[PDB]
From a paper:
a–e, Crystal structures of the five-repeat design E8 (a), two-repeat design H12 (b), and the three-repeat design H10 (c–e) are shown as gray cartoons; the loop, sheets, and helix of the design are shown in dark blue, magenta, and teal, respectively. Central pockets in the designs are shown as gray spheres (a–c). The approach generates a wide variety of structures strongly encoded by their amino acid sequences (as evaluated with RF and AF2, and further indicated by the close agreement between the crystal structures and design models), with between 2 and 7 repeat units (N), repeat lengths of 15 to 78 (L), and all ɑ-, ɑ/β-, and all β-folds.
In pseudocyclic proteins, such as TIM barrels, β barrels, and some helical transmembrane channels, a single subunit is repeated in a cyclic pattern, giving rise to a central cavity that can serve as a pocket for ligand binding or enzymatic activity. Inspired by these proteins, we devised a deep-learning-based approach to broadly exploring the space of closed repeat proteins starting from only a specification of the repeat number and length. Biophysical data for 38 structurally diverse pseudocyclic designs produced in Escherichia coli are consistent with the design models, and the three crystal structures we were able to obtain are very close to the designed structures. The large set of pseudocycles with central binding pockets described here combines the diversity of native protein scaffolds with the stability and robustness of de novo-designed proteins, and our RIF docking and Rosetta design calculations suggest that the designed pseudocycles provide better starting scaffolds for small-molecule binder design than do either native structures or previously designed de novo NTF2s.
Author numbering:
A (entry chain B), B (entry chain A): 4 to 139
Amino acid sequence: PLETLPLEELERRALKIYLRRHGSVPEEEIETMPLEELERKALQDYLRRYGTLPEEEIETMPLEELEREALKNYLRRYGTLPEEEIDTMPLEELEREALKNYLRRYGSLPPEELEKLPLEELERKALIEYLRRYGP
Amino acid sequence: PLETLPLEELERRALKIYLRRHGSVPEEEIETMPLEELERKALQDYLRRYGTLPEEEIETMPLEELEREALKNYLRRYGTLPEEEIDTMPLEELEREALKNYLRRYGSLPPEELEKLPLEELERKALIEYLRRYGP
């Protein structure tokens, strides 16, 4: 049933299931939040667990910084690529590597595709995979 | 031609021609700057030439709020919906109504099909219709 969902609905549902699994927030008050805020509170749950930073910076950091550190942690624990160029790797590339890393582990797709699939389609398959494993 | 390139490269070209025409950016970085830097500096330029925002505020503004104000500004001078909605409409809905508004002034698609497209595809046409107007 997830095929009929466009990319804006897949990101919403995936962020919901994640926030319904990690973090305690009213379940009926999750649906009414804007998608900009869904990522901020989802990636706040991520940073609070895998990398104990200052507790109030994570509340006030911009959304581009919350995502950058969340992607950085993902490559440190799930990737052998050196820590050095993780800081210098652009945001457009941290996302790409974090999705190829995700689709190789929890995905039945050969790496020949994951290196040729664009970033927009890499976001699709990784979001449809997360839902078919952790949700309806 | 342009339809064969991915959505990441479309935006990379679109933001490149914009920097070369509007404002002053050294053209010695045809593709060396990251996509995160292309979006940022091109947004502060639009927030400066087409708006009345503080200088010392946008240079420290995050990306999720630079884009928010750019759509709030773009929807004002080119939109029909009232101003009260602009502050309440979420960021994901600000992008949708901004992309549809652009695809009308410079669009050969029928408006009934403009709605049929999801937000992921409205961006492709807007970027492609932009490059056919300002690109070689």
